[PDB]
């Protein structure tokens, strides 16, 4: 009926070939060779458009029918070549895109453009169930082109139906994708819309002449049915008489590097921190220089200088775990599983979001309830045990080879690995001039190294995730703080025997034990909620609770201690990389005063003591000690200690806290909506609303503690034992990954036989994990010796870590140590032990009764033994399991 229904019945009625022809005919095009070759290998510092929307939005902000500003929301982010040229505008402060991706659509891809330190993208989002928020400028190039009007019009509306919520929350500006603006329905919306909010259509002539598509912005205006004629008219024109030539133009160029961006950073305490700030200028103020394009919000910048980058993204398959774990070539928690991105970009793109933050100050009644609790429980730890300086000697005791470096300075490049330096005089020469350097109360040497963690985590976009940071110091300042503290870790202040409440050593065999315990007790529900990046919310008010145990020590302990702790803990001096412009890194160096790093000694001990003082704050406030004002300031200051005096072990015992994770079990239900001191301390809870009630557990057999649940079983003769046990993926993932590059197939073996024999020791209860352990000690020289890191957790102590047979080490660790089982008669056979409940082991990620899995483990011995053809015949190989 219309100019353009009109329009698209013909272009409808047209066949292949000219459809060819009028596809491309008369529009202007961008010359995306360059962009797409950069794209073929992944070039990100080549700052080219991801897509050919960065020329729509170019063109439509240049030309001037949009004026963008502020916070900014992609709306189906796409690639997110919107988000990249939003990132570029000058007026623009924080660029949020969404978009769903997944199976077949878009992921997000990830690129250095100029501004990238303010790009947020997410996946998986069905935006129409998304709730609003109120942007400053609104993007929408939704919109899915089809043959028939009546869905292009259906899917333009509910579009519009989507984002008219959004924009009655006044945006500055905004651009939203037109796909049908030329029927009777769509004319009338049209009007109505624009009568309704403002704006203006334009029809951009980079767009095909193949869709109606028009673009609603803001600082234009016209009439609908004018815009609309004038496009459906043009494109009538175009299709008959001459196939008129394309347009040429250059795709834009978004540059590269980071953005000047709000620095709300507190002030350093200059004279601290002076002394290793301007010895790392003098010596490297050859290419010292100031980058203005610090992407630190909650940082102190302090400058920045050339350096060389460090890690990779790259991750190798293991293929004797792979190959003979062939069914699960298909579960996505299993290949979509691979290494983390521990370059300066990958550790920038989670340093930016993860670590730039401020916490919260608590108001100062919780200041003066923590207070209370700290040093209530440094009375109460401090009671039986008191502190002590360790000795160097105690120091190369627990040291071995494989620690790190820290070469900071000129005069620590020398050693290469630990046990060769920690035997060279020189060394202690310097650790006793900086321990004296402490007693005199200024800092030379100890700072902070910083980069991203190796890890074997779940692939994001399709891509390797980025890697969490980790931070370490010198050798030489780690003996310092051994010295002063590390007596907490070597005391075991934090093992169960002194505190009650945490398990400082125990493995992950006794915990059960423990959870069934703690389960006999009675109350309420169980309680356990991970806390959200426990290191960043650390607060100085923290760290000063902490700094109480020195009230027992003695003069001289207390004096290396608090020197220690004040120009160390309560102020810290990092240095980074960060990818520069243009292909180069650079290394800035930045300070802060609160938060903590897992790179220090005490990190587990400082972990566990904050969080249990946390949660005694809130046993008080689920129990109702606490009262709703006490927040901001302390009411009857003596009912804390009446209550911690009189309920303080008694609720204690009933804890279980390992560094960052927790279990508790309160009185009662109350404990689930205790919140409000939790969220003013800046402890907040991991992905869940702030105020929403805590999720309980009522059977202790489903609680999870350090990614594990715990699980009775019954042997086969009558004894009772305690198992840990996750995802069957995770596992299987986590051994299909090689952390390193260029290691022989030796060693990566070594690397499949550790897996093998970690499995055979501690997930045995699962029927494919002890299958394909069997199966890869059965394929794995049994001569080799195993090498490599497993699963990071220090509650895994490394028993598996021996050509040893694991039936005898099985033995040892879950009868005669035993110390929850009486019975010390040692079972002689492997399938004497029990698997874990079939329908419980099918829930924990077994593949169990599946036809692929029943193909695979038929052809057991052929896959096995052609491993073995591989590795090489004439190897010493054994035949494990038969049955
Ligand atoms: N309802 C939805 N919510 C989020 N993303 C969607 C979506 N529907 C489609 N998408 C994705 O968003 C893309 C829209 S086109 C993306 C253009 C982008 N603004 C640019 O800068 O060039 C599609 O490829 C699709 O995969
Ligand atoms: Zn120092
Ligand atoms: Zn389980």
Do not use: K
């Given at each position: 009926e219309t100019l353009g229904e009109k329009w698209k019945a013909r272009l409808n009625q047209m066949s292949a070939l000219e459809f060819y022809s009028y596809k491309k005919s008369g529009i202007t095009e961008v010359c995306r060779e360059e962009a797409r070759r950069a794209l073929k290998d992944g070039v990100a510092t080549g700052g080219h458009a991801v897509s050919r929307g960065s020329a729509k939005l170019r063109w439509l902000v240049e030309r001037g029918y949009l004026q963008p500003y502020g916070k900014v929301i992609d709306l189906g982010?796409?690639?997110?070549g919107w988000s990249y040229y939003a990132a570029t505008i000058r007026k623009v402060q924080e660029v949020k895109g969404y978009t769903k991706g997944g199976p077949g659509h878009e992921e997000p891809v990830l690129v250095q453009s100029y501004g990238w330190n303010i790009v947020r993208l997410k996946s998986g989002v069905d935006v129409f169930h998304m709730a609003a928020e109120p942007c400053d400028t609104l993007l929408c190039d939704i919109g899915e082109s089809s043959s028939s009007p009546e869905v292009e019009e259906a899917r333009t509306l509910r579009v519009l139906s989507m984002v008219g919520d959004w924009l009655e929350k006044r945006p500055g500006a905004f651009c939203i994708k037109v796909?049908?603006?030329?029927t009777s329905t769509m004319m009338e919306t049209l009007e109505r819309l624009q009568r309704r909010y403002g704006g203006g259509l334009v029809r951009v002539?980079?767009?095909?002449?193949?869709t109606h598509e028009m673009y609603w912005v803001s600082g234009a205006k016209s009439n609908t049915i004018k815009s609309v004629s004038t496009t459906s008219q043009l494109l009538l024109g175009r299709m008959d008489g001459p196939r008129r030539p394309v347009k040429y133009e250059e795709d834009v160029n978004l540059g590269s590097g980071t953005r000047a961006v709000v620095s709300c950073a507190e002030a350093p305490n200059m004279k601290i921190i002076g002394n290793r700030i301007e010895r790392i200028r003098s010596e490297h103020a050859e290419t010292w220089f100031f980058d203005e394009n610090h992407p630190y919000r909650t940082w102190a910048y302090h400058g920045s200088y050339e350096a060389p980058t460090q890690g990779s993204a790259s991750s190798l398959i293991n293929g004797v775990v792979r190959l003979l774990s062939k069914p699960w070539d298909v579960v996505t928690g299993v290949t979509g599983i691979a290494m983390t991105d521990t370059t300066p970009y990958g550790q920038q793109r989670v340093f930016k979001e993860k670590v730039d933050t401020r916490v919260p100050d608590p108001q100062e009644g919780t200041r003066q309830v923590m207070s209370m609790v700290s040093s209530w429980l440094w009375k109460e730890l401090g009671k039986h045990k008191r502190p002590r300086v360790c000795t160097k000697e105690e120091f190369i005791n627990k040291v071995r080879s494989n620690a790190a470096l820290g070469a900071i300075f000129e005069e620590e490049k020398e050693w290469k690995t630990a046990v060769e330096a920690v035997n060279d005089p020189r060394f202690w020469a310097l650790v006793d001039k900086e321990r004296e350097h402490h007693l005199r109360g200024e800092c030379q040497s100890c700072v902070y190294n910083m980069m991203g963690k190796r890890e074997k985590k779940q692939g994001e976009f399709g891509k390797a995730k980025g890697s969490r940071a980790i931070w370490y110091m010198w050798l030489g300042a780690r003996f310092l703080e051994f010295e002063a503290l590390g007596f907490l870790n070597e005391d075991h202040?934090?093992?169960?025997?002194?505190?009650?409440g945490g398990v400082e050593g125990l493995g992950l065999q006794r915990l059960g034990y423990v959870l069934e315990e703690m389960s006999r007790i009675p109350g309420g529900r169980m309680y356990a909620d991970d806390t959200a990046g426990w290191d960043t919310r650390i607060s100085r008010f923290d760290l000063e609770n902490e700094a109480l145990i020195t009230n027992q020590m003695e003069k001289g302990h207390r004096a290396l201690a608090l020197a220690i702790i004040k120009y160390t803990y309560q102020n810290k001096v990092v240095k980074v990389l960060r990818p520069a412009e243009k292909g180069k890194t650079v290394m800035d160096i930045i300070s802060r005063q609160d938060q903590r790093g897992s790179g220090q000694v005490v990190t587990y001990a400082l972990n566990t003591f904050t969080n249990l003082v946390v949660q005694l704050i809130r046993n008080m406030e689920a129990e109702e000690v606490l009262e709703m004002q006490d927040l901001w300031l302390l009411r009857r200051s003596e009912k804390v200690t009446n209550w911690l005096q009189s309920n303080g072990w008694d609720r204690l015992k009933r804890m279980a806290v390992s560094g960052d994770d927790c279990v508790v079990k309160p009185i009662d239900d109350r404990f689930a909506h205790a919140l409000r001191f939790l969220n003013d301390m800046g402890k907040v809870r991991k992905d869940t609303q702030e105020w929403k009630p805590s999720t309980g557990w009522d059977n202790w057999e489903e609680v999870p503690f350090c990614s594990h649940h715990f699980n009775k079983l019954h042997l086969k003769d009558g004894r009772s034992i305690v198992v840990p046990c996750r995802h069957q993926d995770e596992l299987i993932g986590r051994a299909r990954v090689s952390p390193g590059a260029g290691w022989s197939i030796r060693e990566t073996a070594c690397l499949a036989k550790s897996y093998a024999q970690m499995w055979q020791l501690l997930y045995f209860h699962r029927r494919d994990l002890r299958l394909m352990a069997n199966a890869i000690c059965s394929s794995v020289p049994v001569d080799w010796v195993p090498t490599g890191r497993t699963t990071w957790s220090i509650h895994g102590k490394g028993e598996w870590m021996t050509t040893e047979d694991m039936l005898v080490v099985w033995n040892r660790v879950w009868i005669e140590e035993n110390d929850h089982m009486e019975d010390k008669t040692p079972v002689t056979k492997w399938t004497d032990i029990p698997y874990l409940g079939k329908r419980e082991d099918l829930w924990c990620g077994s593949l169990i009764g599946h036809r692929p899995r029943t193909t695979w483990a038929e052809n057991i011995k052929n896959t096995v033994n052609m491993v073995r053809r591989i590795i090489g015949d004439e190897e010493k190989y054994m035949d494990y399991l038969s049955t």
């Open positions: 982010c796409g690639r997110g796909l049908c603006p030329y002539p980079l767009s095909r002449n193949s202040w934090m093992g169960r025997e002194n505190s009650g």
